Short mmCIF file of N, CA and C in Angstrom, two decimals:
data_model
loop_
_atom_site.label_atom_id
_atom_site.label_comp_id
_atom_site.label_asym_id
_atom_site.label_seq_id
_atom_site.Cartn_x
_atom_site.Cartn_y
_atom_site.Cartn_z
N UNK G 198 -128.56 68.94 69.18
CA UNK G 198 -128.71 68.94 67.73
C UNK G 198 -127.39 68.74 67.01
N UNK G 199 -126.28 68.74 67.74
CA UNK G 199 -124.97 68.62 67.12
C UNK G 199 -124.75 67.21 66.60
N UNK G 200 -124.26 67.11 65.37
CA UNK G 200 -124.02 65.82 64.74
C UNK G 200 -122.66 65.23 65.05
N UNK G 201 -121.76 66.00 65.66
CA UNK G 201 -120.41 65.55 66.01
C UNK G 201 -119.68 65.01 64.79
N UNK G 202 -119.71 65.79 63.71
CA UNK G 202 -119.08 65.37 62.47
C UNK G 202 -117.75 66.04 62.21
N UNK G 203 -116.66 65.30 62.43
CA UNK G 203 -115.34 65.83 62.17
C UNK G 203 -115.08 65.91 60.67
N UNK G 204 -114.03 66.66 60.31
CA UNK G 204 -113.66 66.77 58.91
C UNK G 204 -113.16 65.45 58.34
N UNK G 205 -112.39 64.70 59.13
CA UNK G 205 -111.85 63.43 58.64
C UNK G 205 -112.96 62.41 58.41
N UNK G 206 -113.93 62.34 59.32
CA UNK G 206 -115.01 61.37 59.16
C UNK G 206 -115.89 61.71 57.97
N UNK G 207 -116.19 62.99 57.77
CA UNK G 207 -117.05 63.38 56.67
C UNK G 207 -116.34 63.24 55.33
N UNK G 208 -115.08 63.68 55.25
CA UNK G 208 -114.38 63.65 53.98
C UNK G 208 -113.98 62.24 53.57
N UNK G 209 -113.50 61.44 54.52
CA UNK G 209 -113.04 60.08 54.25
C UNK G 209 -114.09 59.11 54.77
N UNK G 210 -114.67 58.33 53.86
CA UNK G 210 -115.63 57.29 54.21
C UNK G 210 -115.20 55.97 53.59
N UNK G 211 -115.91 54.91 53.95
CA UNK G 211 -115.68 53.60 53.35
C UNK G 211 -116.13 53.69 51.89
N UNK G 212 -115.26 53.38 50.93
CA UNK G 212 -115.64 53.56 49.53
C UNK G 212 -116.74 52.60 49.14
N UNK G 213 -117.63 52.99 48.23
CA UNK G 213 -118.70 52.09 47.81
C UNK G 213 -118.16 50.92 47.02
N UNK G 214 -118.87 49.80 47.11
CA UNK G 214 -118.51 48.61 46.36
C UNK G 214 -119.05 48.72 44.94
N UNK G 215 -118.18 48.48 43.96
CA UNK G 215 -118.56 48.54 42.55
C UNK G 215 -117.84 47.44 41.79
N UNK G 216 -118.39 47.09 40.63
CA UNK G 216 -117.87 46.01 39.80
C UNK G 216 -117.34 46.60 38.51
N UNK G 217 -116.08 46.31 38.20
CA UNK G 217 -115.45 46.73 36.96
C UNK G 217 -115.39 45.54 36.01
N UNK G 218 -115.94 45.72 34.81
CA UNK G 218 -116.04 44.65 33.82
C UNK G 218 -114.96 44.82 32.77
N UNK G 219 -113.99 43.90 32.77
CA UNK G 219 -112.95 43.92 31.74
C UNK G 219 -113.55 43.44 30.42
N UNK G 220 -112.85 43.76 29.33
CA UNK G 220 -113.33 43.38 28.01
C UNK G 220 -113.33 41.86 27.86
N UNK G 221 -114.28 41.31 27.09
CA UNK G 221 -114.31 39.85 26.90
C UNK G 221 -113.11 39.31 26.15
N UNK G 222 -112.37 40.16 25.43
CA UNK G 222 -111.18 39.69 24.73
C UNK G 222 -110.14 39.16 25.70
N UNK G 223 -109.93 39.85 26.82
CA UNK G 223 -109.03 39.34 27.85
C UNK G 223 -109.59 38.10 28.53
N UNK G 224 -110.91 38.03 28.68
CA UNK G 224 -111.53 36.87 29.31
C UNK G 224 -111.34 35.61 28.46
N UNK G 225 -111.47 35.74 27.15
CA UNK G 225 -111.43 34.59 26.26
C UNK G 225 -110.00 34.08 26.09
N UNK G 226 -109.83 32.77 26.17
CA UNK G 226 -108.50 32.18 26.06
C UNK G 226 -108.01 32.23 24.61
N UNK G 227 -106.75 32.60 24.39
CA UNK G 227 -106.25 32.72 23.02
C UNK G 227 -106.12 31.36 22.33
N UNK G 228 -106.19 31.41 21.00
CA UNK G 228 -106.08 30.22 20.17
C UNK G 228 -105.34 30.61 18.90
N UNK G 229 -104.75 29.65 18.19
CA UNK G 229 -104.09 29.97 16.93
C UNK G 229 -105.09 30.51 15.92
N UNK G 230 -104.65 31.42 15.05
CA UNK G 230 -105.58 32.06 14.11
C UNK G 230 -105.97 31.15 12.96
N UNK G 231 -106.97 31.60 12.20
CA UNK G 231 -107.44 30.89 11.03
C UNK G 231 -106.63 31.32 9.81
N UNK G 232 -107.11 30.95 8.61
CA UNK G 232 -106.37 31.23 7.39
C UNK G 232 -106.29 32.72 7.10
N UNK G 233 -107.31 33.49 7.51
CA UNK G 233 -107.33 34.92 7.22
C UNK G 233 -106.48 35.74 8.18
N UNK G 234 -105.92 35.12 9.22
CA UNK G 234 -105.09 35.82 10.18
C UNK G 234 -105.83 36.38 11.37
N UNK G 235 -107.16 36.32 11.38
CA UNK G 235 -107.96 36.81 12.49
C UNK G 235 -108.44 35.64 13.35
N UNK G 236 -108.34 35.81 14.66
CA UNK G 236 -108.81 34.79 15.60
C UNK G 236 -110.33 34.81 15.62
N UNK G 237 -110.95 33.76 15.09
CA UNK G 237 -112.39 33.69 14.95
C UNK G 237 -112.97 32.77 16.02
N UNK G 238 -113.97 33.26 16.74
CA UNK G 238 -114.64 32.50 17.79
C UNK G 238 -116.14 32.51 17.54
N UNK G 239 -116.82 31.51 18.11
CA UNK G 239 -118.26 31.37 17.94
C UNK G 239 -118.99 32.55 18.56
N UNK G 240 -120.07 32.98 17.90
CA UNK G 240 -120.81 34.15 18.35
C UNK G 240 -121.55 33.87 19.65
N UNK G 241 -122.05 32.64 19.81
CA UNK G 241 -122.87 32.32 20.97
C UNK G 241 -122.05 32.04 22.23
N UNK G 242 -120.73 32.00 22.13
CA UNK G 242 -119.86 31.78 23.28
C UNK G 242 -119.20 33.06 23.77
N UNK G 243 -119.70 34.22 23.35
CA UNK G 243 -119.12 35.51 23.75
C UNK G 243 -119.39 35.75 25.23
N UNK G 244 -118.35 35.92 26.04
CA UNK G 244 -118.55 36.14 27.48
C UNK G 244 -118.91 37.59 27.76
N UNK G 245 -119.08 37.89 29.05
CA UNK G 245 -119.41 39.24 29.49
C UNK G 245 -118.95 39.47 30.92
N UNK P 288 -120.64 49.52 24.77
CA UNK P 288 -121.19 48.22 25.12
C UNK P 288 -121.07 47.25 23.96
N UNK P 289 -121.31 45.97 24.23
CA UNK P 289 -121.27 44.96 23.18
C UNK P 289 -122.42 45.17 22.20
N UNK P 290 -122.11 45.06 20.92
CA UNK P 290 -123.11 45.27 19.88
C UNK P 290 -123.97 44.02 19.72
N UNK P 291 -124.91 44.08 18.78
CA UNK P 291 -125.79 42.95 18.54
C UNK P 291 -125.02 41.79 17.90
N UNK P 292 -125.58 40.59 18.04
CA UNK P 292 -124.92 39.39 17.54
C UNK P 292 -124.84 39.41 16.02
N UNK P 293 -125.87 39.95 15.36
CA UNK P 293 -125.89 39.96 13.90
C UNK P 293 -124.76 40.81 13.33
N UNK P 294 -124.50 41.97 13.94
CA UNK P 294 -123.40 42.81 13.47
C UNK P 294 -122.05 42.15 13.71
N UNK P 295 -121.89 41.47 14.85
CA UNK P 295 -120.61 40.86 15.18
C UNK P 295 -120.34 39.62 14.33
N UNK P 296 -121.38 38.91 13.92
CA UNK P 296 -121.20 37.66 13.20
C UNK P 296 -120.69 37.90 11.79
N UNK P 297 -119.80 37.01 11.34
CA UNK P 297 -119.38 37.01 9.94
C UNK P 297 -120.52 36.64 9.00
N UNK P 298 -121.55 35.97 9.51
CA UNK P 298 -122.59 35.38 8.69
C UNK P 298 -122.61 33.87 8.72
N UNK P 299 -121.73 33.24 9.50
CA UNK P 299 -121.66 31.79 9.62
C UNK P 299 -121.63 31.32 11.07
N UNK P 300 -121.84 32.21 12.03
CA UNK P 300 -121.81 31.85 13.43
C UNK P 300 -120.49 32.08 14.13
N UNK P 301 -119.56 32.81 13.52
CA UNK P 301 -118.26 33.07 14.11
C UNK P 301 -117.96 34.56 14.05
N UNK P 302 -117.19 35.02 15.04
CA UNK P 302 -116.81 36.43 15.13
C UNK P 302 -115.35 36.53 15.54
N UNK P 303 -114.74 37.65 15.18
CA UNK P 303 -113.33 37.89 15.47
C UNK P 303 -113.16 38.54 16.83
N UNK P 304 -111.98 38.33 17.42
CA UNK P 304 -111.70 38.88 18.74
C UNK P 304 -111.48 40.38 18.70
N UNK P 305 -111.21 40.95 17.52
CA UNK P 305 -111.03 42.39 17.43
C UNK P 305 -112.35 43.14 17.56
N UNK P 306 -113.45 42.56 17.07
CA UNK P 306 -114.74 43.20 17.24
C UNK P 306 -115.27 43.06 18.67
N UNK P 307 -114.87 42.01 19.39
CA UNK P 307 -115.30 41.86 20.77
C UNK P 307 -114.43 42.63 21.75
N UNK P 308 -113.29 43.15 21.31
CA UNK P 308 -112.40 43.93 22.18
C UNK P 308 -112.87 45.38 22.17
N UNK P 309 -113.81 45.69 23.06
CA UNK P 309 -114.36 47.04 23.13
C UNK P 309 -113.32 48.05 23.60
N UNK P 310 -112.36 47.63 24.43
CA UNK P 310 -111.34 48.55 24.91
C UNK P 310 -110.26 48.84 23.88
N UNK P 311 -110.15 48.00 22.85
CA UNK P 311 -109.15 48.22 21.82
C UNK P 311 -107.73 47.87 22.21
N UNK P 312 -107.53 47.23 23.36
CA UNK P 312 -106.18 46.88 23.78
C UNK P 312 -105.64 45.69 22.99
N UNK P 313 -106.50 44.76 22.60
CA UNK P 313 -106.08 43.58 21.87
C UNK P 313 -106.06 43.85 20.37
N UNK P 314 -105.17 43.14 19.67
CA UNK P 314 -105.04 43.26 18.23
C UNK P 314 -104.94 41.88 17.61
N UNK P 315 -105.33 41.78 16.33
CA UNK P 315 -105.33 40.52 15.62
C UNK P 315 -104.69 40.64 14.24
N UNK P 316 -103.81 41.62 14.04
CA UNK P 316 -103.18 41.85 12.74
C UNK P 316 -101.97 40.93 12.61
N UNK P 317 -102.25 39.66 12.33
CA UNK P 317 -101.21 38.64 12.14
C UNK P 317 -101.50 37.86 10.87
N UNK P 318 -101.20 38.43 9.70
CA UNK P 318 -101.37 37.70 8.44
C UNK P 318 -100.19 36.76 8.22
N UNK P 319 -100.22 36.07 7.08
CA UNK P 319 -99.19 35.10 6.72
C UNK P 319 -98.53 35.51 5.42
N UNK P 320 -97.20 35.41 5.37
CA UNK P 320 -96.42 35.74 4.19
C UNK P 320 -95.55 34.54 3.83
N UNK P 321 -95.62 34.04 2.61
CA UNK P 321 -94.81 32.87 2.23
C UNK P 321 -93.38 33.27 1.88
N UNK P 322 -92.53 32.25 1.74
CA UNK P 322 -91.13 32.44 1.39
C UNK P 322 -90.98 32.26 -0.11
N UNK P 323 -91.16 33.35 -0.85
CA UNK P 323 -91.05 33.33 -2.30
C UNK P 323 -89.59 33.54 -2.69
N UNK P 324 -88.92 32.46 -3.10
CA UNK P 324 -87.52 32.58 -3.46
C UNK P 324 -86.91 31.38 -4.13
N UNK P 325 -86.21 31.62 -5.24
CA UNK P 325 -85.41 30.61 -5.90
C UNK P 325 -84.19 31.28 -6.50
N UNK P 326 -83.06 30.58 -6.47
CA UNK P 326 -81.80 31.18 -6.88
C UNK P 326 -81.62 31.06 -8.39
N UNK P 327 -80.51 31.63 -8.87
CA UNK P 327 -80.20 31.54 -10.29
C UNK P 327 -79.79 30.13 -10.69
N UNK P 328 -78.97 29.48 -9.85
CA UNK P 328 -78.37 28.21 -10.23
C UNK P 328 -79.44 27.13 -10.40
N UNK P 329 -80.41 27.07 -9.49
CA UNK P 329 -81.49 26.12 -9.64
C UNK P 329 -82.42 26.49 -10.79
N UNK P 330 -82.58 27.79 -11.05
CA UNK P 330 -83.55 28.23 -12.04
C UNK P 330 -83.07 27.91 -13.46
N UNK P 331 -81.81 28.20 -13.76
CA UNK P 331 -81.36 28.12 -15.15
C UNK P 331 -80.38 27.00 -15.45
N UNK P 332 -79.85 26.30 -14.46
CA UNK P 332 -79.07 25.09 -14.73
C UNK P 332 -79.93 23.85 -14.50
N UNK P 333 -80.97 23.73 -15.32
CA UNK P 333 -81.91 22.61 -15.31
C UNK P 333 -81.26 21.46 -16.07
N UNK P 334 -81.56 20.20 -15.75
CA UNK P 334 -81.10 19.10 -16.62
C UNK P 334 -81.60 19.27 -18.05
N UNK P 335 -80.69 19.04 -19.00
CA UNK P 335 -80.99 19.22 -20.42
C UNK P 335 -80.45 18.04 -21.21
N UNK P 336 -81.01 17.84 -22.40
CA UNK P 336 -80.50 16.86 -23.35
C UNK P 336 -80.84 17.33 -24.76
N UNK P 337 -80.10 16.80 -25.73
CA UNK P 337 -80.30 17.16 -27.13
C UNK P 337 -79.89 15.99 -28.01
N UNK P 338 -80.33 16.04 -29.27
CA UNK P 338 -80.04 14.98 -30.23
C UNK P 338 -78.69 15.25 -30.87
N UNK P 339 -77.93 14.18 -31.09
CA UNK P 339 -76.59 14.29 -31.66
C UNK P 339 -76.66 14.60 -33.15
#
């Protein structure tokens, strides 16, 4: 019935795979601003 | 999370990068300031003429 579970094997395992999503502002390539000083981009081209 | 398209839109199909930056790391505070300046010599030594 012994599971042969050492402390190192139980405590340290292969970490789970996960996806970290950076903000779309970093994804989107910069462009010169408009007259108001804010960088305006199309709403339908917003990445994720 | 990202908000709805209607809130993000200006009302013409465009949105600013500050509203899409959910992490707040990016900034867009870059207005424009003109060079308002003229000296005394140009201002008050204008070409003049008068009748004799």
